[PDB]
Design a protein around this nucleic acid. Sequence first.
RNA 1: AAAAAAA
RNA 2: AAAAAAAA
RNA 3: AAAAAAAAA
RNA 4: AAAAA
RNA 5: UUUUUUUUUUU
RNA 6: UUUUUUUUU
RNA 7: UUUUUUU
RNA 8: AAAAAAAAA
RNA 9: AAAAA
RNA 10: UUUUUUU
RNA 11: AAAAA
Lengths: 147, 145, 157, 144, 144, 157, 144, 53
Amino acid sequence: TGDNSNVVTMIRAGSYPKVNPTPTWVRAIPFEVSVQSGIAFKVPVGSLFSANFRTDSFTSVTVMSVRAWTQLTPPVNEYSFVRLKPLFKTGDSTEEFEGRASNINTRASVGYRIPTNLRQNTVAADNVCEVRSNCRQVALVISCCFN
Amino acid sequence: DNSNVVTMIRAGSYPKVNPTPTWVRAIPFEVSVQSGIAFKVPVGSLFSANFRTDSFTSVTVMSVRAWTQLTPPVNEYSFVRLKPLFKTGDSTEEFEGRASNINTRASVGYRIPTNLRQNTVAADNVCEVRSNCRQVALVISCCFN
Amino acid sequence: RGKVKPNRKSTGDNSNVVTMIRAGSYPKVNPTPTWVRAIPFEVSVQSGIAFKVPVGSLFSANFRTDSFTSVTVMSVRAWTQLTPPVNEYSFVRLKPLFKTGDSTEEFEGRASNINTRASVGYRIPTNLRQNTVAADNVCEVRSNCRQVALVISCCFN
Amino acid sequence: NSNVVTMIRAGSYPKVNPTPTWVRAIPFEVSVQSGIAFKVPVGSLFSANFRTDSFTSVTVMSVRAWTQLTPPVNEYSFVRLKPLFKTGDSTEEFEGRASNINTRASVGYRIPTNLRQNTVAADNVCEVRSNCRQVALVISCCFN
Amino acid sequence: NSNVVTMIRAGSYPKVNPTPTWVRAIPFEVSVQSGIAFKVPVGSLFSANFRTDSFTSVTVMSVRAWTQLTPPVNEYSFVRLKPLFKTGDSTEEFEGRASNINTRASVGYRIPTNLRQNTVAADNVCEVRSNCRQVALVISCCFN
Amino acid sequence: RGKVKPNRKSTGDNSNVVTMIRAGSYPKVNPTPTWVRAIPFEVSVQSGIAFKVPVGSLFSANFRTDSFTSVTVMSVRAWTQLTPPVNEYSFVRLKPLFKTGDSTEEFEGRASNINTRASVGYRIPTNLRQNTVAADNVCEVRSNCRQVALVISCCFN
Amino acid sequence: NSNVVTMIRAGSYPKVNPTPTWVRAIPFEVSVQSGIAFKVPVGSLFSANFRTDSFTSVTVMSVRAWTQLTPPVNEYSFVRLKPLFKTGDSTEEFEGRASNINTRASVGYRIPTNLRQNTVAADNVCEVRSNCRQVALVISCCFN
Amino acid sequence: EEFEGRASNINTRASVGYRIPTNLRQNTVAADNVCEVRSNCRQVALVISCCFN
RNA sequence: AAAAAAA
RNA sequence: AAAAAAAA
RNA sequence: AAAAAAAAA
RNA sequence: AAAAA
RNA sequence: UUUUUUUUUUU
RNA sequence: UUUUUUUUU
RNA sequence: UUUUUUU
RNA sequence: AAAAAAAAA
RNA sequence: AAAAA
RNA sequence: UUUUUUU
RNA sequence: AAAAA
Ligand SMILES: [Cl-]
Ligand SMILES: [Cl-]
Ligand SMILES: [Cl-]
Ligand SMILES: [Cl-]
Ligand SMILES: [Cl-]
Ligand SMILES: [Mg+2]
Ligand SMILES: [Mg+2]
């Protein structure tokens, strides 16, 4: 109804505009990490830069929120759990944001938001957070802005 | 927003995710053009690391805008023409724009109606450019997928 | 009231002589306050090579910003300061740079008249507005014109 | 709000001024002898201690004074201000006295718009009298 | 109303000024020679005859003039005023003429706020011209 | 907006320092503009004879009207400048004069007190307000008083 | 707000407290044995793992319990809670069962305001019974 | 910046304080420094409003 | 409602 | 909805 | 709400 | 919402 | 702030 | 009334 | 308005 | 109305 | 309602 | 509000 | 409706 045409139509363009071949890009990047029992795993910021995510052209990224799900079943007799400790170059946190499953067959999950005042860039050498989980793998979805 | 520290998120089930999403983009690039000769613009010029788009193999072109990128010949006013090209059938429209000041760029563009917005691959061509200026700058509004 | 007298200040904003100020307790003072500023300055650029703009350029007599050692940059605007090569329309790119991580943006503006300055700028989000010292960099500049004019909106502190 | 950089569709090159003006409250102290008036020099307003050394002229709007040290024994602090001007010094002795010996005396005065001309380092703002040996000043002024 | 004294629940010692300012209309005459302009000295404003001798500087707001003596034979009185300023004398000849020989000529002029700076005894307010030998002046001014 | 900074102009009509003016294209100027003026001057008259007032009297240092060679006269007012003969009440007549044709009007005013100036004037209709040069005349003046004061409302151009 | 530091016109020194109170939900687990009640020690709430090693007393508000491990074969998880109080233990057996063997049982109880006195590490919150060999507790309490 | 505050009674404390804008509210570890303190008084009491994490 | 045009 | 520590 | 893109009497 | 009663 | 040429679907 | 921690609907 | 992100 | 006296969230 | 058009 | 005074 | 942003 409110459609347009079935043919090409002239554009009365004007002065050459402002342009940017390499713009920013708000993204939710999904990737997994392996975790050993009882040992915290530091999540490298570098996992976010990759051709798998179309983000290999970026070197910096502003992480906004971190969410995590256990990716494999827990040990026998156990309910899946997962923890997150936010890491920041200006000072690591000591928080242990933990989510557990209520059904052994179900993923545990938890996440944390980064306040605006702590949303600085990070590079591949930097770490996002420590992860702990009685499951050997953890799936993460990181809401981050690539720039 | 007024918060100053990390806060828990009571996340739930694992979400539907997509590591290689689409991206709506305006891609600026330039092409060399010879006097009196038409130059087919390759769609492959849109897939390059310079645009963060080498990971794409297809692109739905929406609109095309061209500006003369160099001065015109002596005594002449810049001008640039576009002939949209389509795999299903090239057009014959010559959307032409002429500068009214010799020192000023000549610009023109054309929109692709929804019914012709299919994907194009690197080997495809967007449109034929013509111009008395040896280089034409192009801004192509397109959807990478 | 319960009047005294003196003075001669005629109706509010129309006094012709000095008038006493019933000042009170010594206030909170600051001899060295901050200063939000639009700093104009130029940088030289070679065709094809990036030039990292030092934050130190902002601290200078020419700007009165001498006493400062740190600055919070808000936005950066750029103009080509010189004509372009023959046959060319001016252009200028800006790549923001941060200590926590350099960006890969190339905010570019081009002139539509050869005689006219190409211009472009970019805003720094609040979450990236930390201080920067002289040794720090602001942005990479590229330009077919040999000199680029910059105006940097920042807060000195 | 925005979490990444955003382009600024800037335009023509604007009107700039690398050396803009500055309205300031400049605090500084002066030494005062008993019974002797001290001519406060305008030059004390120019100094890197205030970021104002890049200035050579200043428009004084108002002047406020507080005694900076205790008064003599048995005495309540006090301070006087006599506005001075290049076109003609005034004879007003704007006085303020403490009502608690342990507390500062203060007082100040406003300069009408018609007397707000520039002054230079050589010039004098006002005479200051006080039974206290030091007087803290805060001068509202426009550096230009 | 009250017919006896009543206590005043006074409080802390206020801000005082023994030598305050004063806005005044100062009348005084000046001797004028035929055809010759007379520079009216600002010093005539300072005098115990006006209670203003305690002042050394004064801000002039407006100046009014009247012829103080009769004019020549066959002539109507007249008076001229040319405002004088330290930053730059003016060239206006504000004139007023009597329409009845037996009556005074007058005229005056207002000083804009931006030219109301202090003046001292040495300075001159304005030139005065008149066919009458004396000119009565009334100067609205602020003594400070 | 999209802010810069500097300055210190406090609320409209209360600035204490210089403030930048974002001037633009060079305007239309005029170094020698017109000037509408009330020109006072006196003329001498003999009892019983008319005196043609020259327009040149208006161009003079004493009026700042030096640079002008032409003037459009709007209205002419006249006053007797000196006392009348013994026993007489002052009087003054004005006969307007024009290059296209002198008028035969004698606009006359008389004093009702011997001590008082007789006064009179006349307005020139728009359709007679052409320019006049020094060699031109304005009006004939008559008066039992030997000197007549004139104030001529005109436009210099 | 702004992008730079701003002065705070602070006043008199305020009332301060270096060791304030803290309202918390303390998660921790306890080992349980089949058919045997386990008394939960309040002392479990005082640990550097919870940032509460600095507290020596705590007011318990509510107690919620989940089975932390799978139940025996062919059984649905269940957990009971028997509140305990120094002034007098309760006999309530607040019990929750799982309706899906693979799902946590859960239950909890509230402590009325009149029974919310302080407890120390030696005291006991409640008895826990369960067919599961570990029970996860989350105790809402005010550390003081 | 030298945010200064003085007492108007010799027997009374001088105070002053400052706020950190949001764009400068990053974390700080023990090694870091908050602010320089100057005073003609031998001991300055401080009250720092902060967010531990 | 699409397209070429027109103030 | 509320309580506790902190800002306004 | 953020990010990229996209127009007329 | 940076800097003066 | 009411106004050409060819198509044409619903109303 | 906003930030942080916790219950309640 | 259309894409990616979070309420 | 004058004079003396007499208070809180 | 003391002192300036 | 209560005393002394006058409307 | 003569002369300044
Ligand atoms: Cl299930
Ligand atoms: Cl381009
Ligand atoms: Cl041009
Ligand atoms: Cl008064
Ligand atoms: Cl400003
Ligand atoms: Mg051209
Ligand atoms: Mg269980």
